[PDB]
């Protein structure tokens, strides 16, 4: 713990073809385990992770049917959004949804999750109370007042608070050998000139899982925030992740700088210097 399940749904409308492209992806603890793409051979949800293979035909069919339902839902929402914003015709727009639930180490519910976005910007989202809504802007107020009249909230809460948790449990038990594993980070430091009397020090973390991690540079016992570049954790390509933290150091004083790696699977933090 924590633990989570999330479904990332994207829909992109294309000119001339009044059928939007619908892509939905499901993750557990942030690992992809199911996917559906309407531009596929014969659209149907597919296993992304091994532990999803034990699911019978009934599981897939039902899941795929919902997708067919979302294609519709997203087809109309797009059309409605197109209007709210006085947008033209024959263009390309994006509607995205994030939904799911989180659990503590005990597997009980920590938070319900539901949120939408249009054209890359927050549109409307369910509040942590799973009863109220926050509308990004004017148009979202229309959807907001429209959803409060029908009581959409209660239904989502029903799902997010129950069904969501149940399915997450099953996925968690089915692939626990896969999901519940931790791969500790391996670290090393690289040296690179930056300016006349300035140097670049790069701290590396490789092959760790889950993706979560913290990298810091310190002088004596204080962390460095200035001229300290932190790059976005990236996928190794085999399930593990990589990341590095760089800091600009005066030439000849490197030795007084230390790197530290904090990660779930580490008994204690990794501490290293240049060498």
């Amino acid at each position: 713990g924590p633990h989570s399940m999330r479904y990332f749904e994207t829909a992109v409308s294309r000119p001339g073809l009044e059928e939007p492209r619908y892509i939905s992806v499901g993750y557990v603890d942030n690992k992809e385990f199911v996917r559906f793409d309407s531009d596929a051979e014969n659209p149907r949800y597919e296993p992304r992770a091994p532990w999803m293979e034990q699911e019978g035909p009934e599981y897939w069919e039902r899941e795929t049917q919902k997708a067919k339902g979302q294609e519709q839902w997203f087809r109309v929402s797009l059309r409605n959004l197109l209007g709210y914003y006085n947008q033209s015709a024959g263009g390309s727009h994006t509607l995205q949804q994030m939904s799911g639930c989180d659990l503590g180490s005990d597997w009980r519910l920590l938070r319900g999750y539901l949120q939408f976005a249009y054209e890359g910007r927050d549109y409307i989202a369910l509040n942590e109370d799973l009863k109220t809504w926050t509308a990004a802007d004017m148009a979202a107020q229309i959807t907001r007042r429209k959803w409060e009249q029908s009581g959409a909230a209660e239904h989502y809460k029903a799902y997010l608070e129950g069904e969501c948790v149940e399915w997450l449990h099953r996925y968690l038990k089915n692939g626990n050998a896969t999901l519940l594993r931790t791969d500790s980070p391996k670290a090393h430091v690289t040296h690179h000139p930056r300016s006349k009397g300035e140097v670049t020090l790069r701290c590396w973390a490789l092959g760790f899982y889950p993706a979560d991690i913290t990298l810091t540079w310190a002088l004596n016992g204080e962390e460095l925030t200035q001229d300290m570049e932190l790059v976005e954790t990236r996928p190794a390509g085999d399930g593990t992740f990589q990341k590095w933290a760089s800091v600009v150091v005066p030439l000849g004083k490197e030795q007084n700088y230390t790197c530290r790696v904090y990660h779930e699977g580490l008994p204690e933090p990794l501490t290293l210097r240049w060498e």
């Binding site: 839902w73 109309v76 929402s77 409605n80 959004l81 709210y84 509607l95 939408f116 549109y123 409307i124 959807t143 429209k146 959803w147 029908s150 959409a152 239904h155 989502y156």
Partner: peptide, 4 residues
């Protein structure tokens, strides 16, 4: 569920 109602649309946007």
């Amino acid at each position: 569920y109602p649309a946007l």
